[PDB]
């Protein structure tokens, strides 16, 4: 019976690169605390695994056994919206990093894709936010986002970790996850 991967909170860890991308069209975002994330799960019908949370998600996402970590790689928010990012189990955790880095590559995706802010919504099993790149900044970015909570696994033999970042309120299918005065704002930078 295999032994999962363990992980981490990484909230503060992540929210100074996270409210220094949304920055005065955004609000800064604040920790959320477990509870407040298993609340905001359970109103949209999300119960497992228990009492969820961001580490209990990340493990979840990873995959139940540390030797192997299988589904990292290919993890996504197709069932547990929020930012996802697996990296490899053989290198540093630095959520500067990580989140700098899917910011570059979603938003690049944004801009190259049809989207357009008046009709786009926000679909994951659909371009463009079928690129987890560019789910990642429809949640960095949203309006709906108040709050944050990060955990990363930790402790992965193999495959990679994930961290994932839990946004209240998440973003949904048929959100419009940008303002037209937003993306105008987002091509300007």
Do not use: M
């Amino acid at each position: 019976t295999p032994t999962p991967p363990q992980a981490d909170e990484k909230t503060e860890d992540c929210l100074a690169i996270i409210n220094k991308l949304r920055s005065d069209l955004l609000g800064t975002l604040a920790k959320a605390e477990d509870t407040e994330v298993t609340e905001s799960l359970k109103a949209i019908k999300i119960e497992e695994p228990a009492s969820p949370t961001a580490p209990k998600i990340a493990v979840t996402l990873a995959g139940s056994n540390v030797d192997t970590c299988e589904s990292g790689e290919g993890a996504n928010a197709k069932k547990y919206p929020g930012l996802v990012i697996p990296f490899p189990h053989d290198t540093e955790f630095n959520c500067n990093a990580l989140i700098q880095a899917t910011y570059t590559a979603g938003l690049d995706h944004l801009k190259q894709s049809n989207f357009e802010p008046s009709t786009g919504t926000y679909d994951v099993e659909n371009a463009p936010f079928n690129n987890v790149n560019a789910s990642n900044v429809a949640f960095l970015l949203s309006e709906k986002s108040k709050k944050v909570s990060c955990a990363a696994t930790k402790d992965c033999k193999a495959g990679h970790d994930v961290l994932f970042c839990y946004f209240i309120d998440p973003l949904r299918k048929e959100d419009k996850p940008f303002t037209a005065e937003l993306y105008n704002a987002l091509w300007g930078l």
